[PDB]
Structure formats: structure tokens, C-alpha cells
Design an enzyme around this catalytic site. Structure first.
Site, PDB file in Angstrom:
ATOM      1  N   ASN A  23      54.733  58.830 -15.949  1.00 28.09           N
ATOM      2  CA  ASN A  23      54.323  59.671 -15.974  1.00 28.09           C
ATOM      3  C   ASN A  23      52.774  60.804 -15.439  1.00 28.09           C
ATOM      4  O   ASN A  23      53.178  59.818 -14.358  1.00 28.09           O
ATOM      5  CB  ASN A  23      53.009  59.258 -18.059  1.00 28.09           C
ATOM      6  CG  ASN A  23      52.347  58.169 -17.558  1.00 28.09           C
ATOM      7  OD1 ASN A  23      52.169  56.846 -18.520  1.00 28.09           O
ATOM      8  ND2 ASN A  23      51.619  58.198 -16.283  1.00 28.09           N
ATOM      9  N   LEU A  34      50.489  47.405 -13.776  1.00 30.64           N
ATOM     10  CA  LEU A  34      51.015  48.971 -15.186  1.00 30.64           C
ATOM     11  C   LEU A  34      50.988  48.994 -16.293  1.00 30.64           C
ATOM     12  O   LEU A  34      50.779  49.624 -16.900  1.00 30.64           O
ATOM     13  CB  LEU A  34      52.372  49.278 -14.140  1.00 30.64           C
ATOM     14  CG  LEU A  34      52.753  49.476 -12.995  1.00 30.64           C
ATOM     15  CD1 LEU A  34      53.957  49.784 -12.906  1.00 30.64           C
ATOM     16  CD2 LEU A  34      51.885  51.142 -12.028  1.00 30.64           C
ATOM     17  N   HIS A  68      51.238  52.375 -19.117  1.00 33.27           N
ATOM     18  CA  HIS A  68      52.703  53.034 -18.537  1.00 33.27           C
ATOM     19  C   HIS A  68      53.227  52.278 -19.674  1.00 33.27           C
ATOM     20  O   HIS A  68      53.093  51.137 -19.674  1.00 33.27           O
ATOM     21  CB  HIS A  68      53.259  52.671 -17.719  1.00 33.27           C
ATOM     22  CG  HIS A  68      53.066  53.161 -15.979  1.00 33.27           C
ATOM     23  ND1 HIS A  68      53.968  54.458 -16.157  1.00 33.27           N
ATOM     24  CD2 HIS A  68      52.622  52.847 -14.905  1.00 33.27           C
ATOM     25  CE1 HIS A  68      52.671  55.265 -15.425  1.00 33.27           C
ATOM     26  NE2 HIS A  68      52.060  54.384 -14.591  1.00 33.27           N
ATOM     27  N   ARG A  78      63.058  58.182  -7.324  1.00 37.43           N
ATOM     28  CA  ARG A  78      62.673  57.308  -6.799  1.00 37.43           C
ATOM     29  C   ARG A  78      63.001  55.654  -6.491  1.00 37.43           C
ATOM     30  O   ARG A  78      62.559  55.095  -7.615  1.00 37.43           O
ATOM     31  CB  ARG A  78      60.746  57.790  -7.667  1.00 37.43           C
ATOM     32  CG  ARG A  78      59.949  57.302  -6.655  1.00 37.43           C
ATOM     33  CD  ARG A  78      58.626  58.316  -6.810  1.00 37.43           C
ATOM     34  NE  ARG A  78      57.817  57.181  -7.080  1.00 37.43           N
ATOM     35  CZ  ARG A  78      56.605  56.858  -5.858  1.00 37.43           C
ATOM     36  NH1 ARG A  78      57.274  57.409  -4.086  1.00 37.43           N
ATOM     37  NH2 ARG A  78      55.399  56.135  -5.546  1.00 37.43           N
ATOM     38  N   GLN A  94      63.563  54.443 -11.132  1.00 38.65           N
ATOM     39  CA  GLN A  94      62.384  55.545 -11.310  1.00 38.65           C
ATOM     40  C   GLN A  94      63.794  56.555 -11.701  1.00 38.65           C
ATOM     41  O   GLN A  94      64.422  57.448 -10.408  1.00 38.65           O
ATOM     42  CB  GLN A  94      61.687  55.508 -10.572  1.00 38.65           C
ATOM     43  CG  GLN A  94      60.618  57.247 -11.931  1.00 38.65           C
ATOM     44  CD  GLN A  94      59.396  57.151 -11.059  1.00 38.65           C
ATOM     45  OE1 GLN A  94      59.176  58.607 -10.760  1.00 38.65           O
ATOM     46  NE2 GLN A  94      58.526  56.185 -11.060  1.00 38.65           N
TER      47      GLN A  94
END
Length: 168
Positions: free
Chosen positions: A105, A125, A129, A58, A66
Site C-alpha cells: 500500500n 509490518l 499491511h 520489487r 512484491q
């Protein structure tokens, strides 16, 4: 006491099986030891499983790259060195800019093996995270990877961790 020198991990990246280059990371073992240790050990393979041969599933240009789903290759898998999942260790460090390394997550207290590398400041974020390292060399290789993503994260070429481990 004065901290020890933080550990360094490398990834050698390939694009459709062709070598691209190497990205190396400082892991903030000083401040986020349990989360740094998981990513370190998955990078050397020393527990019997880890990142070598896995993909970046991703990638969103302008946002983040990611990976770390070494079991299902799509964002639905992965496991930590501690069990399937582990808690959010702390939120000391923030998503300040390009190069920050943080845990993906599936909600609070669900860390496994998935991670992302920011290509911008991503302050929305912060606090959900866990940030645990940063790119120290080869940010240019991350920028090359980034081009192969799209708005929905789907990659246009196959981006893989051909090799990974620890350099002294």
C-alpha cells in the site's frame, strides 16, 4: 456456522520468458473476505483486468517478493475490483513467517492490487499491511524468485506471472 473451504489461486512464474514453476495460495476468505475476493478475481481476470502477464517489480532477498502493479509495472500503478483503492479491512492476521501473502500500500486505507509474499517473519509490518493468505505449495518457487532481487528491490532478470487463475 462452520467455515467453507477457503479458495486456492495459482501463479505460473517465468524468468526472462522461461518457465520456472507454479506457486499456489490459500486465501483467507473466512477472516478477510473483501481483500481475498479482490486478489481472487484479479487472478482469474473475470472483471476484465488482472494479474496475467504482470511482473514482480520489487524483490528484496531475505525480506519479500512484491508484484501486482499490472498497469504501470513499477510500483506506481494497479487498481482494485472496487475502485482505485479500498480501506484496510482488518489486521486480524500477522506476518508470522515465510509464505505470508499481504497487501502492499501507499499508507493507511490505500489498497489497490499490489501484494507481497514474505520470505521471513516481518513483524514490523503488522497492523499496517493487511494479511489475507499464505503460500500452500511452491514456496520453493518463491525462494527461486527471491534470488533475482537485490537490496534496493531491483530485479536482475524479468520475473513474470505467465498464467494465473483458480484451481478447484
Amino acid at each position: 456456522s462452520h467455515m467453507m473451504v477457503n479458495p486456492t489461486v495459482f501463479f505460473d512464474i517465468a524468468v526472462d520468458g522461461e518457465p520456472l514453476g507454479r506457486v499456489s495460495f490459500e486465501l483467507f476468505a473466512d477472516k478477510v473476505p473483501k481483500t481475498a475476493e479482490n486478489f481472487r478475481a484479479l487472478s482469474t481476470g473475470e472483471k476484465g483486468f488482472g494479474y496475467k502477464g504482470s511482473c514482480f517489480h520489487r524483490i528484496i532477498p531475505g525480506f519479500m517478493c512484491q508484484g501486482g502493479d499490472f498497469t504501470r509495472h513499477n510500483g506506481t500503478g494497479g487498481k482494485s475490483i472496487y475502485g482505485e483503492k479500498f480501506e484496510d479491512e482488518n489486521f486480524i492476521l500477522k506476518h508470522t513467517g515465510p509464505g505470508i501473502l499481504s497487501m502492499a500500500n501507499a499508507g493507511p486505507n490505500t489498497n489497490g492490487s499490489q501484494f507481497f509474499i514474505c520470505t521471513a517473519k516481518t513483524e514490523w509490518l503488522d497492523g499496517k499491511h493487511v494479511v489475507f493468505g499464505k503460500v500452500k505449495e511452491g514456496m520453493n518457487i518463491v525462494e527461486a524468485m527471491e534470488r533475482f532481487g537485490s537490496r534496493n528491490g531491483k530485479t536482475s532478470k524479468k520475473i513474470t506471472i505467465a498464467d494465473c487463475g483458480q484451481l478447484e
